[PDB]
Amino acid sequence: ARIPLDPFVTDLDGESARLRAAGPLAAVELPGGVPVWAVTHHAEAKALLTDPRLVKDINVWGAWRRGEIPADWPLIGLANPGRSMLTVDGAEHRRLRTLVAQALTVRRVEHMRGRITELTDRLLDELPADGGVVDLKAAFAYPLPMYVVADLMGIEEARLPRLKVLFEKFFSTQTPPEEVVATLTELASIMTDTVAAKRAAPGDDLTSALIQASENGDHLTDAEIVSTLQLMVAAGHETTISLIVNAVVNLSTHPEQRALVLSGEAEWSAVVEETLRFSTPTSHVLIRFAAEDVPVGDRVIPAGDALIVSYGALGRDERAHGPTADRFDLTRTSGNRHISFGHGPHVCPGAALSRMEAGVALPALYARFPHLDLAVPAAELRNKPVVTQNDLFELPVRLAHH
Ligand code: HEM
Numbered sequence: 001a002r003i004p005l006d007p008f009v010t011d012l013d014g015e016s017a018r019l020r021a022a023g024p025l026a027a028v029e030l031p032g033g034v035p036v037w038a039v040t041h042h043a044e045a046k047a048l049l050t051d052p053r054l055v056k057d058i059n060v061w062g063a064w065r066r067g068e069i070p071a072d073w074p075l076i077g078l079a080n081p082g083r084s085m086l087t088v089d090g091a092e093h094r095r096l097r098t099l100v101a102q103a104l105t106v107r108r109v110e111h112m113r114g115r116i117t118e119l120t121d122r123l124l125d126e127l128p129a130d131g132g133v134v135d136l137k138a139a140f141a142y143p144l145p146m147y148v149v150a151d152l153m154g155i156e157e158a159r160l161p162r163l164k165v166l167f168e169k170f171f172s173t174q175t176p177p178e179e180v181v182a183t184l185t186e187l188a189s190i191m192t193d194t195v196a197a198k199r200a201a202p203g204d205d206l207t208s209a210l211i212q213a214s215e216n217g218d219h220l221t222d223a224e225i226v227s228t229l230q231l232m233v234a235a236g237h238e239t240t241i242s243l244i245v246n247a248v249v250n251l252s253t254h255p256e257q258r259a260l261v262l263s264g265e266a267e268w269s270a271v272v273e274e275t276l277r278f279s280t281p282t283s284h285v286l287i288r289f290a291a292e293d294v295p296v297g298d299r300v301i302p303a304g305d306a307l308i309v310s311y312g313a314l315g316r317d318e319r320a321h322g323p324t325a326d327r328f329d330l331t332r333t334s335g336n337r338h339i340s341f342g343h344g345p346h347v348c349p350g351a352a353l354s355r356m357e358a359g360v361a362l363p364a365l366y367a368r369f370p371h372l373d374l375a376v377p378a379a380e381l382r383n384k385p386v387v388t389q390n391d392l393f394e395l396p397v398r399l400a401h402h
Helices: 012-021 042-049 090-100 106-110 113-125 136-141 143-153 157-171 177-200 206-212 222-253 255-262 268-278 351-368
Strands: 025-030 034-039 285-290 294-296 299-301 306-309 396-398
Touching: 034 042, 042 294, 042 306, 090 222, 106 351, 113 136, 113 143, 113 351, 136 143, 136 222, 136 351, 143 157, 143 206, 143 222, 143 351, 157 177, 157 222, 177 206, 177 222, 206 222, 222 255, 222 268, 222 351, 255 268, 268 351
Parallel strands: 034 306
Antiparallel strands: 025 034, 285 306, 294 299
């Protein structure tokens, strides 16, 4: 009855359906045969996300304290990440979130609109005009979040060419494991240089702001700042890309809704929010452990067991959005907002940033290429082999009728 999560993501929607069916708490198996629990219903997910009994501390994981976890387990990196706001809870977590929130603010994001608009137009200018097939992901969606975050972080523009090469290697599924590790260090090198540069000469960027953040004398250490910058790249690059990609796929497959937005009858923000609910870029999130036995519906998560949050599956929970939860409809009016950015203390601090990027990129893209459409059947689109993410291999499209 256990549900094996396909690492090659050959059937995301089918898997999500099975997960909801086996919800609220579904017994699942992670790539490599590692069993864990997964909350697959909206209501139950929010409850656990705010339950102090479910912590990030990997030490609470029974199978962990033992030898049930293969040292070569591919997903070990997501299960046991480096120190950051991601690996802690309670007071330690509140400290990091409050300090970071003084830097990555709503205001800072609003003030990035102009720059995001400029980068978007620059990337659109680079798109071919021949009328042939173009991979909108590689040529538009992928590079945007990279340049935006670099600008936000205050990374020296002369380092961009190298940053691009590093990003390519770091996120490429074909990069040798050892090379990925080496690349992460060079990225850390650029981040550290940035922190050193801003300490030497403060400016109006996110790094300078992270340096200056303070709580009655308390502040972020160089290590905490660097781990935060690294986490923002790890958590916000591919997600933002997929948000843009999935939005284009959804509009392409729902003509009447695309029309509503192009005519101005529907807002672009509705495209973004429905895309986050219906096709979130983050299908599953590792990982939490029960410090004590925790009741979930008719079942119970034994103390020491693991729990992943299946945002992809619960996004279409009919108990939260009614009968039409199984389809894309940006005109819906549910009594429950989606929780694709999480819920509770660990709620995504990049929600405003991603919404701003997609909110600028999508309108600009369609204003210039109003007739853009998929160059292949939607069914022919495929996911990248990353079990926790909903990223497409590519986005073949024809910008205009050739
Ligand atoms: C629309 C694209 C995005 C989605 C769907 C998304 C989703 C999420 C979710 C679901 C979580 C929490 C997982 C859990 O606790 O169960 C999270 C955490 C996080 N996200 Fe995002 N995210 C997106 C973009 C970004 C961006 C652009 C950034 C960079 C500022 C970012 C930075 C983070 C960080 C730092 C955390 C850790 C929060 C913590 O553990 O305290 N995210 N995100």
